[PDB]
Amino acid sequence: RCTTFDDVQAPNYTQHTSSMRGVYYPDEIFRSDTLYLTQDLFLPFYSNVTGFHTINHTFGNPVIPFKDGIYFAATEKSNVVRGWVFGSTMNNKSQSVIIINNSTNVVIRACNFELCDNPFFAVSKPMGTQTHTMIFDNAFNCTFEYISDAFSLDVSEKSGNFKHLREFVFKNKDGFLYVYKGYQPIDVVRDLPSGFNTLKPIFKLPLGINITNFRAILTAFSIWGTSAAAYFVGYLKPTTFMLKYDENGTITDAVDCSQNPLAELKCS
Amino acid sequence: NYNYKYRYLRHGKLRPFERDISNVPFSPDGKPCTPPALNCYWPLNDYG
Amino acid sequence: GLTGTGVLTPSSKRFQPFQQFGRDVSDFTDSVRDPKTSEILDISPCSF
């Protein structure tokens, strides 16, 4: 059911800085105390970030093209932003994949999917029970289904400090879909904090679909409803970075090459 | 054996390890057509 | 997936759960993660 509500408003595309984020581990190989170069599809430094200040008068869920991997972020409280829709033509003829939670565990399904105009998590504000998870309406010519390990999870609305900051990299490569993950508690008013947060190689998916367009999946509070929490989107680029490992085996600094002449001097 | 098919009408070539299934009414200028209209076919084709 | 010739010893690492190899400075392995729950350095220069 194309359950599209009324108050769906978009901002004037608030621009933010990608200051030092999107840096992750390019491989599953330890090193230590080195200055390692790599030419790989990374987020640039400093660049423009399309902010989605999703508030109770701004229901941010448009269609966004993928365009060679995205960087994604979510300043949230109690895990609102579960669910991504990755499709080709975003409709019933599209061999698309859906990435959700059943409040217990990650469920990822790739099939032909009649995509309604606004499916949603009918999440109650005091309770947070996904009763109307109507996402799997129909299923035909289906291909893939994966369930991860179950772990602790919150659903409903909270407030306070910016305890939950999710930073993800969703990267297409050779038919594989790479999904990278890293976490850090922060405290901003409403903007992206500066600082680097390393990611980790969680998921490699062997699907091989025409990843062109994507959307996110929200929790409409029980009439939609949100909180004082927002989320950010940026585009990657085929560039070349230098990483400075420590003695412990952790990224402590990253330097772009294609940014500034000082930066190419540093990585040269 | 007319049970197996292939596709020969794609707007562009492929990235590696990628699979097209959807029977789109192929027309060289977008154009959702009704085959058998002109330049509006099905990309599916048998083997024999 | 690795062959070679060397002298083995226990490590001093802060190794990662997903990592498996060491490639210490420039494709020189020097530390591996055993498939039966250990982490050993690799002095592949036995003596020469």
Spell out the domain ranges in chain A. Answer: 15-268
Interior/surface letters B1-16, b for 16+ CB within 10 angstroms, e for the rest: eeeeeeeeeeeeeeee
Dist CA A114 CA A139 (whole Å) = 8
> Would you state the structure tokens that stand for residue B41, as one six-digit string?
């076919």
CA distances from A266 to A46, A124, A131, A262 (A): 17, 52, 54, 6
DSSP result, A37-105: EEEEEEPPSS-EEEEE---TT------EE--S-EEEEEEESSS----EEEESSSSTTSEEEEEEE-SSS
The strand ranges marked E within B1-48 are 6-7, 44-45
Residue B48 near residue B2 (C-beta atoms within 8 A): yes
Could you tell me which of A98, A83, A87, A102 has the C-alpha nearest to residue A216? A83
Could you tell me which of A65, A92, A137, A108 has the C-alpha nearest to residue B22? A92
Dist CA A224 CA A157 (whole Å) = 13
Q: Which residue's structure tokens are 């091989």?
A: A208
Residue A1: how many CB atoms within 10 A of its CB?
A: 10
Residue A17 CB burial class (10 angstroms; 0-12, 13-18, ≥19): middle
Using an 8 Å CB-CB cutoff, list chain B residues near A89.
22
Dist CA C41 CA C21 (whole Å) = 10
**What phi and psi, each to the nearest 5 degrees, are found at residue A261?**
-55, -35
Query: Given a contact as 3+ CB pairs under 8 Å, which chains touch B?
Result: A
A249 and C20 within 8 Å at the Cβ level: the answer is: no
Tell me, in Å, the resolution of the deposited structure. 3.9
Contacts by A251-258, CB closer than 8 A, 24 or more apart: A251/A23, A251/A25, A251/A196, A251/A198, A253/A196, A254/A20, A254/A23, A254/A196, A256/A44, A256/A45, A258/A44
A249 and C16 within 8 Å at the Cβ level: the answer is: yes
Residue A31 CB burial class (10 angstroms; 0-12, 13-18, ≥19): buried
Dist CA A197 CA A43 (whole Å) = 13
Query: Given a contact as 3+ CB pairs under 8 Å, which chains touch A?
Result: B, C
Instruction: Go through chain C and tell me how many residues it has.
Output: 48
Residue A61: how many CB atoms within 10 A of its CB?
A: 19
Interface residue C28 vs chain A (CB under 8 A)? no
Dist CA A53 CA A46 (whole Å) = 20
Q: Is CATH 3.40.390.10 the classification given to domain A15-268? A: no
DSSP result, A193-204: PPS----EEEEE
Q: Are strands A48-52 and A230-235 parallel, antiparallel or unpaired?
A: antiparallel
Closest chain A C-alpha to B42 CA, distance in angstroms? 15
> Which of B16, B20, B24 has its CB closest to that of A175?
B16
Residue A221 CB burial class (10 angstroms; 0-12, 13-18, ≥19): buried
> Which of A30, A200, A248 has its CB closest to that of C31?
A30
Show Cβ contacts of residue A234 under 8 Å, excluding neighbours closer than 6 positions.
A18, A22, A43, A47, A48, A49, A50, A70, A71, A72
- Tell me the longest C-alpha to C-alpha distance in chain C: 34
Residue A167 near residue A200 (C-beta atoms within 8 A): no
Show Cβ contacts of residue A251 under 8 Å, excluding neighbours closer than 6 positions.
A23, A25, A196, A198, A243, A244, A245
Interior/surface letters A190-202, b for 16+ CB within 10 angstroms, e for the rest: eebeeebbbbebe
CA of A31: which chain C residue's CA is closest?
A: C24
Dist CA A162 CA A12 (whole Å) = 24
Closest chain B C-alpha to A176 CA, distance in angstroms? 8
Query: After which residues do gaps appear in chain B, with C to N over 2.5 Å?
Result: none
Report the number of secondary-structure helices (H) and strands (E) in chain C. 0, 3
Using an 8 Å CB-CB cutoff, list chain A residues near C22.
29-31
